[PDB]
Design a protein around this nucleic acid. Sequence first.
DNA 1: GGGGGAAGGACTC
DNA 2: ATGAGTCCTTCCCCC
Length: 341
Amino acid sequence: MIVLFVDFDYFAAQVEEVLNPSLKGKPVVVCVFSGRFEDSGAVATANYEARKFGVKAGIPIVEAKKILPNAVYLPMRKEVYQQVSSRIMNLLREYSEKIEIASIDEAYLDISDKVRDYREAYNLGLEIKNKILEKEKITVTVGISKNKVFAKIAADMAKPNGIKVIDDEEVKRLIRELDIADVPGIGNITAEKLKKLGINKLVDTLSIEFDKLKGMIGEAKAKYLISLARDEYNEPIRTRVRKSIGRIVTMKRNSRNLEEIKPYLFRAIEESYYKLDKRIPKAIHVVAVTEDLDIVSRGRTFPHGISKETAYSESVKLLQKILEEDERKIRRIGVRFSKFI
DNA sequence: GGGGGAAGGACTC
DNA sequence: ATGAGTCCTTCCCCC
Ligand SMILES: [Ca+2]
Ligand SMILES: [Ca+2]
């Protein structure tokens, strides 16, 4: 198989640059302001100018300003980035019918029936980077290899404004040499579990007893990693259909008082129904983030679609249950809708 | 034994 | 110490 992965460069920040070019060359930081206090919230994405100094997605906004007090700080404009992303995704469809939109700035293309080798594959990547640059003035990084996983790794290695092929021989190299923490789907919690087994490379998963591996990291992740180490990983490029839509908002102050929470919960439903646009959910889940950043949820499935008014009443009931069955204060509250008709 | 739903968990970006 | 969404695991009802 030949997979060509497109990863939009520091997307939200770069979009802000396209709309206001004077930002070029400067450290740009797109943030989500939580509104609890002055500058509360976190960084959603920074351009490379900002990243060079350790201003990155995830850190508090306050911290970022300590490091870069004179950087441009901008609020998330999600809807804008989405409209821009949609137009780019529409460009990529010109190069394959087999295309998987993984997120707002990631797309996988099965180009097996378009190019005969990696030479032709790498050229088509150039053609794609150019096209996106011509039409939208956005840079992207293209990663190419025999499966989705290594294509992503190609792009991890080449970003930003890059392009890389990981040919058959280098896959073998990487199975032996690549730090297993850098495998897509291996986070700190799992990396830690693995290192605690001597496993630092994909190849190591082939010499450990399977039950030992499964026993610690679960059956799926084990099968996953072994298949990669065997050079047998296969997952076809599939059109993804969204499976849920939801909104979760930060409360101005923590609480377990139902009337205090209701208004935030209700705003989350309003926004969610806006987002659903024509899709009718059969399942609603209420999601709370506790004071200690734990996540608790209660949901219910219906043998029919959920109307906004049913969402409103059921959500209160589900929030109650959360309050009855857990004593902590809530920091964040929201809703998630799924099981579309 | 395992299918399917609910809730918690990890990870992605 | 934000926000959105996906897949997996555990535990339990049930066949
Ligand atoms: Ca990106
Ligand atoms: Ca990792």
